[PDB]
Amino acid sequence: PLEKASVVSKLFFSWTRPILRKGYRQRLELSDIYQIPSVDSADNLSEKLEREWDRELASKKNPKLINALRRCFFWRFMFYGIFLYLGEVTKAVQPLLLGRIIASYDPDNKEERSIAIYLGIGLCLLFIVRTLLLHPAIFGLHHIGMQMRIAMFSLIYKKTLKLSSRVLDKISIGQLVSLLSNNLNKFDEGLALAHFVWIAPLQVALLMGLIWESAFCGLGFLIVLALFQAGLGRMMMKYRDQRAGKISERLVITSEMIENIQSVKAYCWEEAMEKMIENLRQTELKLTRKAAYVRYFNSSAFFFSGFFVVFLSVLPYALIKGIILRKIFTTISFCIVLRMAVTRQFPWAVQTWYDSLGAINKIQDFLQKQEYKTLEYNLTTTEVVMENVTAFWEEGFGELFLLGTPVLKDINFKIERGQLLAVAGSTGAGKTSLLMVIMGELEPSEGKIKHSGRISFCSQFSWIMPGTIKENIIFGVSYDEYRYRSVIKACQLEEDISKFAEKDNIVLGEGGITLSGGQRARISLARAVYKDADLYLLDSPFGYLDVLTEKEIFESCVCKLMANKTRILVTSKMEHLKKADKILILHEGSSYFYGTFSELQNXXXXXXXXXXXXXXXXXXXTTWNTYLRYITVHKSLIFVLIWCLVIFLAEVAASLVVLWLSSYYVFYIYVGVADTLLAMGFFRGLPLVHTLITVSKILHHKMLHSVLQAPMSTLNTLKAGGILNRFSKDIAILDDLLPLTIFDFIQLLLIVIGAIAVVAVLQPYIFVATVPVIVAFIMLRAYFLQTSQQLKQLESEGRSPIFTHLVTSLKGLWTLRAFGRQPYFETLFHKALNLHTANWFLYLSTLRWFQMRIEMIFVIFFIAVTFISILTTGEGEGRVGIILTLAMNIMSTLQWAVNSSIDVDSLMRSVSRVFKFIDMPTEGGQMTVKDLTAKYTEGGNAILENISFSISPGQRVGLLGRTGSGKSTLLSAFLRLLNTEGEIQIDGVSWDSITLQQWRKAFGVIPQKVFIFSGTFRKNLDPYEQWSDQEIWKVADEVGLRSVIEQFPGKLDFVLVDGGCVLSHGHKQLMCLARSVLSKAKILLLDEPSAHLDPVTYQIIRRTLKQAFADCTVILCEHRIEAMLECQQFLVIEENKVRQYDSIQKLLNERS
Ligand SMILES: Nc1ncnc2c1ncn2[C@@H]1O[C@H](COP(=O)(O)OP(=O)(O)OP(=O)(O)O)[C@@H](O)[C@H]1O
Ligand SMILES: Nc1ncnc2c1ncn2[C@@H]1O[C@H](COP(=O)(O)OP(=O)(O)OP(=O)(O)O)[C@@H](O)[C@H]1O
Ligand SMILES: [Mg+2]
Ligand SMILES: [Mg+2]
């Protein structure tokens, strides 16, 4: 529906209560989120931004995006900014009322308490006004940021779809995804904070024009302190930059680890790799600890500023022999606000302004790319003809001309309507370039073209949009049943479409993942045929088709349906060329022949942004069980927390005794500033950070030990990308951000609790006033979290549609440019962006409501405490002032405390998953199988079921079968890689009676895909450090690795960087065979040695196996006829059955 509300409801955010109620009661769905108002429609934002951007481009000599952006959206920005400034002015000014109240209570004046209470009610009204004029302005600024982001995304999508063809191969997909990823939160949330660029200077000017002029020492200290904070900021980036290189090196080791869990389990390498990963983590831990230490010093310096910033301000005026407590209390209340405005607000505003300007400049720079210029095709006679065509891909050579290499030179031809052509050439000859220049994507430097306009495209690359078969074929045109039936019958895709349960509206995903290459190609041909045009362009139409189907499809459709319509074909076959009318051949970017035979014969696709939807969906947030598990894992962490609590309580007790009981007048500062009174020093908080780092290291080590040495069925139940995502993101969050968030939350809760306790001790009525306030805080936070977490999760799940649409549009850019479905793609992109905008808008609205209500509750607490304290007829001069100051300066710390309280739960939502993966479960030589059965996962397809066979010692077994029949599954079942029931006895012992560890070592196998890691040859041969140089040399000599060792510059220590691709397939097979010879096993297992092998390495492998394992049993797997001469026994897998034969010549009797 459409939201609508009155002025009071708009100001107090009372219209978000229905969705809070629904989310609290039950799980939120995509249906309950109401429709965005028309103000924030993607189409409206795009139109409004373009109407100014095009005018700016047409008028301004120097183009800058901010020039149009200001005349677009600056007015409301300033309108919200003035409200923000007037709200902050009240916070700046309110301590004057505090000082006057203190003067009223002090025995200097005889004025009754009536004036004091008349001022206190005004102070509370001032807080109410400041809240009411602060929070809605922040929400409005967030709204402005929303419109900003939506308009920017729409315009940049329009540009990236209108891109020129030349810059497409300047591959910057990573740059584009980074641009659309890193900006969404930064340019949206930061706009509200961006307005403090002049608010802080105006506030400090007001503060120091309202303090008696002396007081400049406070500015001198803050200026040094502000520069000091930036001084440690550079150190942070110095350590982070250094460590970022090492985490990349360690991560790729884990990435290569998941892809070969089978090989790792077979080789029993869990301990060595565990030690290697532990060593790498130990190396990175020092840098992480240094970064955490400097962050702690920065935070502690900020917290300890509070005392010195007033101390160094009062001492210049303390030499004048007298300070009234009213003056010191009011200068404390002024200096806290001054510090808040100087040390944090101004640097944050400057940094966010710089980041926003950089992002806008980068977006403009990308947008200023050269456009795609289409050409009218109204030139008559509707025939394809060119003359003197010169083509240059790069603009520099295109505008100069033979300085650069061309791709088409001096090509001429002319074909009447109905005649079909054929182009043949080598790979990269330029057939695709000729197609592009015919289309108009490539601009010809020389040569005028006159031909028809209606064109059709079937690209080399298969592209399918996320729709259905009918939509993929017709592209929204009127559904012609006769044409559709004719095209499906001609393309012979009916036999494929009718196999599915769905017949007419089969829905596909992105990129046609459901189908295969042949189906995608035939769908592309069907689309090309269906597209009504007088010039059909094809680019390798049958690249993924078989020979028979490719031969049949030509005479079925091409010269039967559009035989009277002109088309251009890409082919290299004599029959197609013979049927073709005129012929063109391209060589080295130049045409080779023109005429007839009458003359001739006479870096990731499924990115983490897309995997996050399936990764974060299992959070199910969190419970206190994970809190307890995370807090009790390490003893020293508990001891340090206990020590911190004891120190806090001791400091509170000392302050209490001091208040119960010369420089005394300058001693009240320490107690009067809870920020410096209860902040943890460098001797009581550094062990906390150290313990957090140790907890992170222990959790990572246990997670590695759990993911490794785990049942393969359960491990394969999850995907490799998903299991790697944890080590990529969750460990980094738990190690870097989590300790800092934990420390900040602990400190901000400790200061607030100490302030409340001491205030209650000075006045016991405030103790009973606080309990309802605390329970209200807790209840309201619990109420808000349930809806907030669900809304954030839904928004995160809704992020990936935008990027999937982006990649889908990019993959088929040429097809979209040829077909003119730009409006359809724009409206679909806007449809997705509207849902994402609605999610983010509701999240922002509920966050603003939460902040409003917590501030209102604190205001109620403040009025209660202040009125009760001022009305009570207390004794002493300090008590009233100190209580008022403490209860007045808390709110700034309380906001950060509650923000950290929500953020710590948001972060620990990840240690929840980490603990779940901690909690995942864990587990001659003759053979005789007894009813073997296994499957990839429980409930899967039992490839092997009720299997019984035996192998004689000192023999060989040859295994033959089609691909995918289950040979790999049988080898895994032998290896105990998968869950199995039954037994196989090696001379009498099965899996059950002996340890699986020694079971694995008794075997030996090379995988279908060999495994190698980024390590030296010595480490890849002997990861366990159980071998010596002489025996390694002996193994290398026996297997024949001397040439392999000497061929590389590093003698036996050449590092295998980037997956060890230096070795060939045969070299890798020799490597793993030598490794198996090292791991001495009485039995050997084999799996397809000749997938991409050459005869010399094949025969050397045969020689090595014959010489090394002549007296064992080898289960060889190969389909070659010549290979099967050395297999005394035979075995075949034919659809879940096994037949063992004494010879192969009798097998040929069955299947000659
Ligand atoms: N947009 C482009 N910008 C720059 N170079 C390009 C672009 N498109 C293609 N090329 C390159 O120009 C050359 C022309 O090759 P083209 O693909 O046109 O020939 P082909 O024989 O049809 O190719 P294929 O081997 O893909 O069947 C190739 O080296 C190709 O990589
Ligand atoms: N990781 C996996 N998860 C789920 N199913 C799988 C997995 N790997 C393979 N399969 C299933 O097993 C089939 C292939 O079985 P497998 O590779 O073990 O037999 P094969 O005859 O040795 O294969 P090939 O000779 O093609 O390597 C696949 O088509 C699929 O149905
Ligand atoms: Mg090509
Ligand atoms: Mg296989």
Numbering used by the authors: 5 to 217, 222 to 409, 435 to 635, 751 to 769, 844 to 883, 911 to 1172, 1207 to 1435
The authors write:
The cystic fibrosis transmembrane conductance regulator (CFTR) is an anion channel that regulates salt and fluid homeostasis across epithelial membranes. CFTR belongs to the ATP-binding cassette transporter family of proteins, but uniquely functions as an ion channel. It consists of two transmembrane domains that form an ion permeation pathway, two cytosolic NBDs that bind and hydrolyse ATP, and a cytosolic regulatory (R) domain that includes several phosphorylation sites. CFTR contains two functionally distinct ATP-binding sites.
In contrast to the case for phosphorylated CFTR, addition of ATP to the dephosphorylated channel caused only a small shift in FRET efficiency, from ≈0.25 to 0.28 ± 0.01. To explore the molecular basis of this shift, we determined the cryo-EM structure of the dephosphorylated wild-type CFTR in the presence of 3 mM ATP to 4.3 Å resolution. Consistent with the smFRET data, the overall CFTR architecture was largely indistinguishable from that of the ATP-free CFTR structure. However, at both NBD1 and NBD2 binding sites, density corresponding to the ATP molecule was clearly evidenced. These data indicate that ATP binding to the dephosphorylated CFTR does not induce any global conformational change. The small shift in FRET efficiency is probably due to local changes that affect either the position and/or dynamics of the sites of labelling. Dephosphorylated CFTR adopts an NBD-separated, auto-inhibited conformation.
